[PDB]
């Protein structure tokens, strides 16, 4: 807004895994205002995945949100007959908003049945640099490359 800036809202850790990267992933999972049926989907997919792969539940999830952290990205201006897409560098707290919704809306776009395991097959494929969520820090990373020419039009 014009007048200035504001804070955000600072959420207290999970009961169990003891991070705030799993409270801010329920707020991406929650919908319509129902934190009941979002905490089935998020503790039934740390142990629907913890079987499949024999290391911890939180180091195969937290490497599943660090292949997805887009480091560059495009923003726009106009010219007067063209409208060029500039590439800007991404802050250290916006890469954590996008990795966590590039992982949860690339899960309703999947052909499994119950979203215990869509979210479960997407934290284990995305841990190996592959599939849906983690081409999209690659969709979004040529566009900051193709446009490497228009960088001087920056702010």
């Amino acid at each position: 807004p014009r007048k200035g800036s504001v804070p955000k809202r600072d959420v207290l850790p999970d009961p169990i895994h003891n991070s705030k990267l799993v409270t801010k992933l329920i707020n991406k999972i929650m919908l319509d205002g129902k934190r009941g049926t979002a905490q089935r989907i998020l503790y039934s997919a740390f142990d629907l995945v913890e079987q499949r792969s024999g290391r911890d539940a939180l180091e195969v999830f937290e490497e599943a949100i660090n292949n997805i952290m887009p480091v560059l990205e495009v923003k726009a201006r106009r010219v007067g007959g063209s409208n060029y897409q500039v590439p800007v560098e991404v802050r250290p707290e916006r890469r954590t908003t996008l990795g966590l919704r590039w992982l949860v809306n690339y899960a309703r776009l999947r052909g499994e049945k119950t979203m215990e395991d869509r979210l479960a097959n997407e934290i284990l494929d995305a841990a190996n640099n592959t599939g849906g969520a983690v081409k999209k820090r690659e969709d979004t990373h040529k566009m900051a490359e193709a446009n490497k020419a228009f960088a001087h039009y920056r702010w």
Binding site: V71, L72, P87, E138, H141, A144, K148, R154
Partner: peptide
């Protein structure tokens, strides 16, 4: 991967403005 070290490389090319060229005769 695209190897996003461009963050380190599109910072020298950021400073050749449209008016920085107008000055600095060679």
């Amino acid at each position: 991967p695209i190897d996003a070290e461009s963050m380190k490389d599109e910072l020298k090319i950021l400073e050749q403005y449209t008016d920085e060229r107008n000055k600095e005769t060679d």
